[PDB]
Scaffold this active site. Structure first.
Site, mmCIF file in Angstrom:
data_model
loop_
_atom_site.group_PDB
_atom_site.id
_atom_site.type_symbol
_atom_site.label_atom_id
_atom_site.label_comp_id
_atom_site.label_asym_id
_atom_site.label_seq_id
_atom_site.Cartn_x
_atom_site.Cartn_y
_atom_site.Cartn_z
ATOM 1 N N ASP A 109 -2.387 5.356 0.761
ATOM 2 C CA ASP A 109 -3.396 4.306 0.743
ATOM 3 C C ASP A 109 -3.630 3.730 2.133
ATOM 4 O OD1 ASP A 109 -3.857 4.654 -1.942
ATOM 5 O OD2 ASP A 109 -2.428 3.107 -2.561
ATOM 6 N N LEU A 129 0.824 -1.201 0.000
ATOM 7 C CA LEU A 129 0.000 0.000 0.000
ATOM 8 C C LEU A 129 0.861 1.255 0.000
ATOM 9 C CD1 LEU A 129 -3.083 -0.152 -0.012
ATOM 10 C CD2 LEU A 129 -2.031 -2.196 0.767
ATOM 11 N N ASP A 130 0.367 2.289 -0.675
ATOM 12 C CA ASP A 130 1.065 3.563 -0.778
ATOM 13 C C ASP A 130 1.133 4.291 0.555
ATOM 14 O OD1 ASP A 130 1.625 3.354 -3.488
ATOM 15 O OD2 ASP A 130 -0.288 4.262 -4.069
ATOM 16 N N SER A 131 1.881 5.396 0.569
ATOM 17 C CA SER A 131 1.885 6.297 1.713
ATOM 18 C C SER A 131 0.467 6.706 2.077
ATOM 19 C CB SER A 131 2.707 7.538 1.373
ATOM 20 O OG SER A 131 3.968 7.198 0.826
#
Ligand SMILES: CCCCCCCCCCCCCCCCCC(=O)OC[C@H](COP(=O)(O)OCCN)OC(=O)CCCCCCCCCCCCCCCCC
Ligand SMILES: CCCCCCCCCCCCCCCCCC(=O)OC[C@H](COP(=O)(O)OCCN)OC(=O)CCCCCCCCCCCCCCCCC
Ligand SMILES: CCCCCCCCCCCCCCCCCC(=O)OC[C@H](COP(=O)(O)OCCN)OC(=O)CCCCCCCCCCCCCCCCC
Ligand SMILES: CCCCCCCCCCCCCCCCCC(=O)OC[C@H](COP(=O)(O)OCCN)OC(=O)CCCCCCCCCCCCCCCCC
Ligand SMILES: CCCCCCCCCCCCCCCCCC(=O)OC[C@H](COP(=O)(O)OCCN)OC(=O)CCCCCCCCCCCCCCCCC
Ligand SMILES: CCCCCCCCCCCCCCCCCC(=O)OC[C@H](COP(=O)(O)OCCN)OC(=O)CCCCCCCCCCCCCCCCC
Ligand SMILES: CCCCCCCCCCCC(=O)OC[C@H](COP(=O)(O)OCC[N+](C)(C)C)OC(=O)CCCCCCCCCCC
Lengths: 89, 83, 124, 85, 182, 481, 648
Positions: free
Chosen positions: D45, D41-43
């Site tokens: 997300d 997962l992204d920063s």
């Protein structure tokens, strides 16, 4: 029921304390009688109003005017004003 | 739901979830006192009760207004706005 | 330090900490505190005017500035009152004359007397 | 009334992550999975995920604590530690 | 009532002497010494002299008894406070429900409260000789005196008649008292 | 009798060692004796009734029946009887409120307390200026000693305030009393309305008398000693001072000032109204920013006395009756609040700072109920004597001067503000972290507070019950031509 | 059996017995017993009302004397007449319903004995308020209801916000009470009494300035009580208390005390047209502001309370028109459906696990909570004055009396009140849609667990629903009748216009409120369901105005900062700078410094020096006396300077 005899400040020598006390008490008691007259007026006005309802104006005009008239004069005023001043001079 | 509470804290309201084990008998006592007080006062205050109208007669009312006029004439009394 | 009344007190302290006061209501409520309800930790220094900045102090609102909120309040009142007053001018006239009553306006029944019928008495 | 159990929390969180789309895979979601590493997962997300979690359990996460949870175990234990959940 | 006995105090004094000071007498919290503290402290509420001896006897007995009672007070209350146990029944029981009388309650409850009740009663009943009642009676008597024919009218008509006359006329005497005014 | 009773006192002291039981018994007997006197008091007469004279030259050590009266005069009318009953009601409670918290030199402490109570009670009996002044000052040494020995941390400054401010006012009172003595050669209260001084001389004497009244009531701007003296006094000192010694001022107006200086009082009344409106508004506002419990309760009394003054100089019967009723109700309520703050909270926690206190309801629900009741009584809830007093006083003040009385009607609001702001913090919130749990109010504390509450409620529901003693007084002092 | 005695005393018992015995009875019996006593009281009141409609001869109960000094004779006198019986209807109905409701609503809470005792206390003191026959008894009730309001709003004592709200309410109503006390003083001085009979007998003769003074004071009191825009901030803080408390306070009694005070004073009000003007216009302002805030608020209880404020202002307008029967009838009708609104709101809140009150988090509950939906729907439709409902017969005719008023200027008030009505339909529809008609906004578990409430909650809603549908129609004749003599207020014939407002009205004005109400309701619903953008825009200016409206019209800001905070600052200035500043300067501290300096100077070669002293004294005395012989005024400065040398 006591009915002490009435005394006035004008007649008395202020050096007999019994008479001076009687004058003070008589003046107070007369003020209280005047109050009773005012309250009798007011009670009659209340009965008049409650029984006359919508036409209380015509029915009770006399009592209302008289009560409003006796209000400023029939309260307590205390004896000091009159014993300490002689209204003649 | 519920939680612990200090048992030493005595309040005349009862405190937390007060539900005494003899509550039905104390309840009988309470309702007895309630009916007693309500009935006693309802009877005791009966003499001080009256209707609003019909207490006095027209005779008294009219004669009192006439007497008031007599008083206002003995003194010098004009009416309101009469000027 | 920030407010005029706190600044007024600066000569009157000698050897007491000149604290910058912060409204305790505006301290964010998720930090932990020794007294959570008052959002104060033990031995925290108190401003001289603390009683104006604790939790028991009158609530402060952050949305509008005080001056701006004053502008809005006065503006609403002025626009409402002025619009109503000017609306009074552009008014239709009625259609039926006001009602009247027998006996010169029942001046007898609302008390009254022959010498004073203007004080008590209807439109007749 | 209504009382939740740790397993109920875990089940709700697992379903939450399952329905999220930017996840790598659904099957790989483990109890000790790292959203940053395992699920990738992204920063932001994971930020969206913590917002979803608070919206689901009806709580409010402070900034300092939201960023602290990095694994699903951390999230489940944190949600179980709060009485009004 | 006479209950003093100098033989007993001269014994009670060393029965106290063995014990530590009441400040340190219970700071352990064996049970034997605590038992003797229980009985000796119980002696405090066992009243041991009445009025016939405080009036008659000398002051050496007075000072000795005073010291004894002081130490008994201390033992009783220090134990009762640092044990949560009463010194009656004789080893330290917990039965705190009842059997507790403070010293102020007798005087206050049996003298002060009755006194306030009496004051309230007296005020209520002294309120009857009020000047309003006196003046209502006096106004009624003045009306009846000037105008005694309403003494022939029946009861219910009377009061209305008196009211009529009061409304119409100034039955007071105030102006009569103000003779120099005219 | 006196010899035998002294023997009894000595023996009780030798055997028991603590005088306090004897003093409690004595004070209760005094209360009963005053009630007997009330029974035998004739109310259909405006004359002093239980007269006696002391230190007359023919009988220095006894009562005088001589035809020359050069001693000190004592006697009572209804006005004195009301306050005497209040005093004898309050004294035993004053003894009882310190029944356990004094553990050193206790006999001396109780002696000072009972002596002060007796001095005030005797002061109400005084019938001439000199004896009134004598017993009016006699308390100051006792108050000084009591506050200095048995007071809190700042008690030395408190004792010096209570002596110095009251002396400062009393000496100007002494100037006025000396002028009256040398001008009239008489001092009595029986016939002093018979002497009509020249208007200028009245205007001069009134100044000394009213300066004494300003310091003792107190009134703005010389009220600053009272909050101190209260906060550092022990409980008995505070209860006595709030409940009796302040009412001595109001009694001083009615007895010493109004009958003698009527015309000058008429001239000066608007100045009195200025000073009373000042004290009400300004002290009520200043109460908002206090941080000490006893200081706040002390500040409340000044405002209530301001309303009392506005009533008593209104030149109306309603105003005077309201001032008296307010004085009595204040004597009931203020000792109760002082009991709370300085005997329950202070004896449990030994601190008076407001920040420490919060949420007392959880552990001590009964104390919280008492606080709520007493505070709503103090701010003037109807069916409490305080409301009757404030209402009648405000009526008189509004009649005497409509503008000033109408503005004074803001006292209702201001009193509510400070009192309810205090009780809000005290009762609710989460229990304080700084303090630990202690016992709830005990049987003795509850007994005292119940006495005061029932007294104020009784005169609040039927204030008429006082009228039989006061119906002469409400006319004895108003000056209408 | 004495109706008036039982009416005053059963609620007193229901109040005091829990306080005396709660530890001995427990909340089960206490709840059941207080409820039962209130039910009996309500039944007695209905029977009395029935007989009074049969025979308008009110009962009086005259008891011992409170005060008999000088000319003032105050007695504990009670009577129940048309006005009082209307108020008692409202009070006893809603108190009985709320007592039943609180059994269910409060079943979990530890402190139920105290709660029910307080509800009963408030009922008792309100009954005292409305039954007393003179202004003094009115004041006794007036202040004790404030005490109970303080004790109720801070019922959850541990909540800081709760106690701050309680303090706010009690202090604002004490402001009202200060003005009320001013009014009592002037009434007693001017009329020599407080009794209704005398004041109403001799009102028409009194100087108009005095009447205006009296009536301004009393109106300020009622303004504080009835939360007009001058003193309203406490109204919306009061929903900190339990929902049953808000039901009792905002429908039947606490906010209606002001309207009752004006209604009782009606006879005085007629001869003082100036205050009537002021009352009318303050009412218009309040109704407008309340509706405006109502649109932009998001809390359920706050919405209902602001609706209460708007309706209070609307009856205030009705008072301002001298349509006193009109305002009384709206008060009675409004009490019922307002209590129903609050109760249904309580049920909706209780259905949510979160117990949230925010309208933006409820979502769609129409399937889940149909009975609560129908109850709240009936209440709303009564409130919007839908045809054939109780709110119609009150609200529509009050709106029309403004147009029918003889004063030309009141036509503006017509449009103001009209705007307020359609404004009202707006927020009623917003709450209805956002609670039952919108897509779900709460999480899934709440919708799983969403369920109706118990019987104790449901039954009173049912009863208040039948009331809010039928009472207006069954009672319209009694209060709005062509010739009705039930309420005996003596309207000045010049002012009376109730015929004109019916005959003069045109089809446009008599139909426009109804048609607008129905349209705007449908418009709001369809716009919400189909064009959400128009509501959920993002314009900066519109967000600004919405923010203004959401914060109680930024008035609460104004108060707390400019009045309350400035007063606390000024109090600090006094207490420090004056009291511990200047007064101590001319007091202990300044005197201490002065004496220190002077004493130091007078103390500041044991022989030579003293000899110099004696010469200096001799020569100085000689020269000083020479000067005095010359002119004494000249020596005063020299003596002053000498003392300055010696002491300073
Ligand atoms: C006319 C005179 C009427 C006089 C009434 C007689 C008083 C008897 C009732 C007092 C008992 C109420 C009480 O004990 O309240 C204590 C309450 C905590 O009690 P609780 O709710 O059980 O537990 C919560 C935490 N323990 O703590 C509280 O929350 C305080 C609430 C106090 C309620 C007092 C009610 C009286 C209010 C009228 C005051 C008017 C003064 C004049
Ligand atoms: C240190 C300060 C300065 C000191 C200055 C003054 C000190 C005085 C010392 C106290 C002595 C006064 C109290 C005793 C005097 C009264 C004794 C008495 O017999 O009362 C006289 C009065 C008339 O009695 P009689 O004419 O004889 O007829 C009887 C019919 N069976 O009979 C009555 O009507 C009864 C009168 C009751 C009086 C009540 C007094 C209240 C307090 C009593 C004790 C006060 C002691 C004060 C101690 C502190 C010092 C002030
Ligand atoms: C600073 C402190 C200042 C302290 C001030 C207090 C001063 C105290 C002075 C005491 C004198 C006042 C006594 C009040 C009179 C009460 C009384 O009557 O006592 C009885 C007896 C004389 O009584 P008799 O004259 O016969 O009248 C009664 C007729 N039924 O009276 C007697 O026989 C005299 C007995 C009293 C002796 C007191 C001696 C001083 C005290 C040591
Ligand atoms: C005198 C006649 C009137 C007194 C009336 C009461 C008599 C009984 C007094 C009493 O109960 O005891 C007083 C006090 C206590 O006795 P005790 O326990 O032995 O003292 C402890 C150390 N031995 O005994 C003492 O401790 C005495 C200690 C004296 C304290 C010194 C400072 C006090 C000064 C008092 C101020 C007086 C100023 C006078 C000016 C006008 C006052 C009216
Ligand atoms: C038209 C003008 C309107 C006048 C209204 C009357 C003003 C007095 C009202 C005082 C008051 O209610 O303050 C209560 C305040 C609670 O306010 P708040 O903190 O915002 O409540 C949070 C609850 N949700 O709690 C507090 O702050 C209490 C602290 C003292 C409040 C009063 C401070 C004195 C300032 C002058 C008041 C008005 C003086 C006379 C006018
Ligand atoms: C020439 C033509 C016109 C002349 C008019 C009158 C002459 C007045 C003479 C002025 C004298 C002034 C006093 C004086 O000489 O003071 C000097 C001296 C102070 O010296 P030192 O010890 O340094 O004091 C400093 C304190 N740290 O102080 C001293 O030496 C002591 C003071 C002695 C002076 C006696 C004054 C007589 C009393 C005056 C009453 C004061 C006010 C009362 C009202
Ligand atoms: C719980 C509320 C119950 C109230 C009514 C029930 C009472 C039954 C009798 C009815 C008559 C009545 O109430 O007065 C009770 C009595 C009798 O006065 P009365 O002459 O008969 O009334 C006059 C009726 N006139 C006008 C027709 C003639 O008055 C009094 O002693 C006044 C003293 C006040 C009480 C003393 C205070 C003690 C209270 C303690 C405070 C905590």
């Amino acid at each position: 029921h006591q009915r002490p005899e009435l005394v006035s400040f004008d007649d008395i020598n202020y050096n007999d304390h019994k008479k001076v006390r009687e004058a003070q008490e008589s003046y107070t008691r007369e003020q209280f009688i005047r109050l009773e007259a005012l309250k009798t007026v007011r009670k009659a006005l209340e009965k008049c109003y409650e029984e006359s309802g919508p036409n209380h104006f015509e029915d009770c005009k006399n009592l209302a005017e008289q009560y409003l008239d006796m209000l400023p004069t029939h309260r307590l005023q205390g004896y000091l004003g009159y014993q300490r001043n002689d209204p003649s001079k | 739901g519920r939680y612990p509470f200090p048992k030493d804290v005595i309040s005349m309201t009862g405190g937390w979830w007060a539900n005494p084990s003899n509550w039905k008998l104390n309840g009988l006592f309470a309702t007895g006192i309630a009916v007693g007080l309500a009935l006693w006062v309802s009877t005791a205050t009966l003499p001080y009760t009256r209707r609003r109208e019909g207490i006095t007669s027209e005779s008294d009312i009219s004669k009192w207004n006439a007497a008031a006029g007599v008083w206002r004439e003995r003194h010098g009394k004009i009416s309101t706005g009469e000027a | 330090i920030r407010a005029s009344f706190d600044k007024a007190e600066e000569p009157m302290l000698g050897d007491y900490p000149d604290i910058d006061p912060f409204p305790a209501q505006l301290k964010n409520p998720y930090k932990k505190y020794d007294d959570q309800q008052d959002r104060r930790n033990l031995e925290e220094p108190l401003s001289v005017n603390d009683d104006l900045y604790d939790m028991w102090s009158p609530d402060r609102f952050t949305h509008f500035k005080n001056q701006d909120a004053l502008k809005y309040f006065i503006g609403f009142l002025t626009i409402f009152f002025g619009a109503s007053y000017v609306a009074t001018y552009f008014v239709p006239e009625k259609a039926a004359i006001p009602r009247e009553f027998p006996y010169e306006g029942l001046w007898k029944e609302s008390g009254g007397t022959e010498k004073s019928k203007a004080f008590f008495g209807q439109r007749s | 009334a209504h009382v939740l159990t740790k397993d109920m929390i875990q089940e709700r969180i697992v379903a939450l992550l399952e329905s999220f789309d930017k996840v790598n895979d659904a099957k790989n979601i483990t109890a000790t999975a790292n959203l940053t590493s395992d699920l990738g997962l992204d920063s932001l997300d994971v930020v969206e995920v913590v917002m979803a979690i608070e919206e689901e359990f009806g709580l409010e996460i402070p900034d300092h604590d939201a960023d602290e949870i990095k694994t699903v175990q951390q999230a489940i234990d944190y949600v179980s530690a709060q009485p009004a959940a | 009532l006479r209950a003093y006995n100098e033989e007993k105090e001269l014994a009670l004094k060393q029965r106290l002497s063995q014990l530590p000071p009441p400040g340190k007498a219970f700071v352990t919290a064996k049970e034997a010494e605590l038992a003797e503290l229980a009985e000796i402290a119980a002696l405090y509420k066992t009243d041991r002299v009445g009025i016939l001896d405080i009036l008659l006897l000398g002051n050496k007995h007075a000072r000795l008894y005073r010291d004894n009672t002081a130490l008994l007070k201390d033992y009783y209350y220090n134990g009762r406070r640092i044990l949560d146990k009463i010194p009656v029944k004789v080893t330290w029981e917990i039965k705190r429900e009842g059997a507790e009388k403070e010293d102020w309650v007798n005087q206050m409850y049996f003298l002060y409260a009755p006194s306030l009740i009496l004051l309230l009663i007296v005020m209520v009943y002294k309120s009857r000789e009020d000047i309003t009642f006196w003046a209502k009676k006096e106004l009624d008597q003045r009306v009846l005196d000037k105008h005694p024919e309403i003494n022939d009218a029946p009861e219910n008509e009377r009061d209305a008649l008196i009211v009529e006359r009061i409304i119409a006329g100034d039955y007071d005497k105030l102006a009569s008292l103000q003779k120099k005014a005219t | 009798i006196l010899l035998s009773s002294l023997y009894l006192f000595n023996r009780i002291l030798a055997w028991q060692g603590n005088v306090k039981h004897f003093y409690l018994f004595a004070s209760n007997l005094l209360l009963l004796f005053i009630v007997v006197l009330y029974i035998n008091f004739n109310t259909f007469s405006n004359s002093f009734q239980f007269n006696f004279e002391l230190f007359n030259s023919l009988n220095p050590f006894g009562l005088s029946n001589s035809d020359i009266s050069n001693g000190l005069l004592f006697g009572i009318d209804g006005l004195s009887l009301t306050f005497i009953l209040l005093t004898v009601l309050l004294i035993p409670l004053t003894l009882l409120g310190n029944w356990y918290n004094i553990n050193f030199n206790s006999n001396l402490y109780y002696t000072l307390v009972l002596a002060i109570g007796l001095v005030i009670l005797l002061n109400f009996w005084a019938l001439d200026y000199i004896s009134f002044y004598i017993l009016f000052e006699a308390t100051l040494p006792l108050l000084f000693i009591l506050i200095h020995i048995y007071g809190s941390s700042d008690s030395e400054r408190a004792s010096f305030y209570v002596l110095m401010f009251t002396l400062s006012g009393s000496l100007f009172m002494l100037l006025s009393i000396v002028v009256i003595s040398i001008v009239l050669n008489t001092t009595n209260f029986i016939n002093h309305n018979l002497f009509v001084l020249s208007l200028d001389l009245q205007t001069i004497i009134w100044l000394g008398l009213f300066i004494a009244i300003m310091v003792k009531t107190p009134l703005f701007p010389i009220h600053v000693w009272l909050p101190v003296v209260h906060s550092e006094s022990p409980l008995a000192g505070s209860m006595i001072l709030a409940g009796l010694i302040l009412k001595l001022a109001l009694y001083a107006i009615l007895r010493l000032l109004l009958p003698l200086l009527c015309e000058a009082q008429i001239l000066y009344t608007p100045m009195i109204y200025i000073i009373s409106l000042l004290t009400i508004i300004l002290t009520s506002l200043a109460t908002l920013r206090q941080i000490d419990l006893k200081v706040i309760i002390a500040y409340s009394s000044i405002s209530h006395m301001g309303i009392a003054i506005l009533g008593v100089c209104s030149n109306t019967s309603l105003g005077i009756y309201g001032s008296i009723v307010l004085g009595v109700a204040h004597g009931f309520v203020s000792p109760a609040l002082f009991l709370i703050v300085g005997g329950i909270l202070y004896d449990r926690y030994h601190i008076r700072i407001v920040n420490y206190y919060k949420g007392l309801t959880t552990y001590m629900p009964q104390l919280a109920t008492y606080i709520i009741i007493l505070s709503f009584a103090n701010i003037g809830t109807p069916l409490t004597g305080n409301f009757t007093g404030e209402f009648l006083s405000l009526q008189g003040g509004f009649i005497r001067n409509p503008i000033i009385g109408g503005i004074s009607c803001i006292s209702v609001l201001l009193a509510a503000i400070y009192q309810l702001k205090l009780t809000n913090k005290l009762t609710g919130g989460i229990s304080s972290i700084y303090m630990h749990r202690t016992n709830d109010v005990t049987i003795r504390e509850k007994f005292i507070m119940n006495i005061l509450i029932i007294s104020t409620l009784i005169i609040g529901i039927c204030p008429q019950i006082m009228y039989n003693l006061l119906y002469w007084t409400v006319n004895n002092y108003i000056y209408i031509i | 059996y004495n109706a008036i005695s039982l009416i005053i005393i059963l609620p007193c018992i229901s109040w005091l017995f829990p306080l005396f015995f709660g530890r001995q009875l427990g909340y089960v019996f206490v709840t059941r017993m207080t409820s039962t006593l209130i039910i009996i009281t309500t039944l007695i009141t209905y029977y009395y009302f029935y007989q009074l409609l049969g025979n308008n001869n009110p009962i009086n109960l005259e008891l011992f004397n409170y005060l008999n000094i000088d000319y003032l004779d105050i007695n504990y006198n009670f009577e129940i007449d048309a006005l009082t019986i209307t108020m008692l209807l409202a009070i006893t109905t809603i108190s009985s319903m709320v007592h039943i409701y609180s059994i269910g609503y409060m079943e979990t809470d530890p402190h139920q004995v105290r709660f029910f005792s307080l509800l009963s206390m408030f009922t008792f003191w309100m009954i005292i308020l409305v039954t007393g026959s003179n202004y003094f008894v009115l004041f006794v009730g007036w202040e004790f209801i404030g005490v109970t309001s303080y004790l109720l709003i801070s019922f959850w004592v541990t909540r800081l916000q709760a106690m701050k709200s309680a303090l706010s309410a009690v202090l604002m109503n004490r402001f009202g009470d200060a003005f009320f006390v001013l009014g009592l003083c002037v009434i007693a001085y001017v009329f020599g009494t407080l009794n209704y009979s005398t004041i109403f007998a001799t009102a028409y003769l009194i100087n108009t300035d005095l009447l205006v003074l009296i009536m301004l004071a009393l109106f300020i009191a009622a303004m504080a009580k009835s939360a007009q825009f001058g003193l309203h901030n406490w109204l919306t803080l009061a929903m900190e208390g339990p929902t049953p408390v808000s039901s009792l306070l905002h429908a039947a009694t606490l906010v209606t005390a002001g309207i009752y005070l004006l209604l009782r004073s009606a006879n005085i009000l007629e001869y003082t047209p100036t205050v009537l003007f002021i009352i009318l216009w303050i009412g218009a302002l309040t109704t407008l502001s309340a509706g405006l805030i109502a649109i932009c608020s998001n809390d359920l209880k706050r919405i209902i309370a602001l609706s209460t404020m708007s309706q209070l202002g609307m009856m205030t307008i009705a008072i301002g028109l001298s349509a006193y029967n009109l305002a009384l009838f709206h008060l009675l009708g409004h009490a019922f459906f307002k209590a129903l609104l609050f109760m249904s709101a309580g049920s909706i809140i209780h259905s949510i696990l979160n117990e949230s009150q925010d309208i933006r988090t409820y979502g769609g509950l129409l399937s889940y909570l149909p009975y609560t939906y129908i109850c709240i729907t009936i209440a709303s439709l009564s409130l919007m004055a839908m045809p054939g409902l109780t709110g119609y017969y009150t609200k529509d005719i009050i709106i029309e009396s403004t147009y029918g008023s003889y004063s030309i200027s009141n036509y503006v008030v017509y449009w103001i009140a009209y705007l307020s009505a359609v404004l009202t339909c707006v927020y009623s529809m917003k709450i209805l849609y956002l609670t039952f008609y919108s897509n779900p906004n709460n999480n899934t578990i709440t919708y799983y667990n969403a369920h109706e409430s118990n019987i104790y909650i449901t039954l009173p809603m049912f009863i208040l629903a039948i009331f809010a549908m039928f009472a207006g129609w069954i009672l319209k004749d009694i209060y709005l009748g062509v010739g009705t003599d039930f309420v005996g207020t003596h309207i000045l014939p010049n002012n009376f216009s109730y015929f004109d407002t019916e005959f003069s009205i045109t089809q446009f004005y008599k139909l426009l409120p109804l048609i607008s109400a129905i349209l705007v309701s449908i418009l709001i619903v369809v716009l919400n369901e189909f064009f959400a953008i128009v509501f959920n825009l993002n314009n900066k200016y519109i967000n600004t105005v919405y923010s203004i409206f959401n914060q109680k019209l930024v008035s609460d800001q104004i108060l707390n900062h400019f009045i309350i905070f400035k007063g606390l600052v000024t109090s600090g200035n006094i207490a420090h700078h004056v009291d511990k500043g200047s007064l101590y300067r001319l007091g202990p501290v300044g005197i201490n410094r002065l004496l220190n300096k002077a004493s130091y100077n007078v103390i500041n070669s044991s022989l030579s020096m003293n000899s110099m002293l004696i010469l200096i004294t001799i020569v100085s005395l000689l020269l000083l006396v020479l000067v005095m012989n010359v002119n004494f005024i000249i020596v005063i400065p020299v003596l002053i300077s000498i003392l300055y040398i010696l002491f300073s």
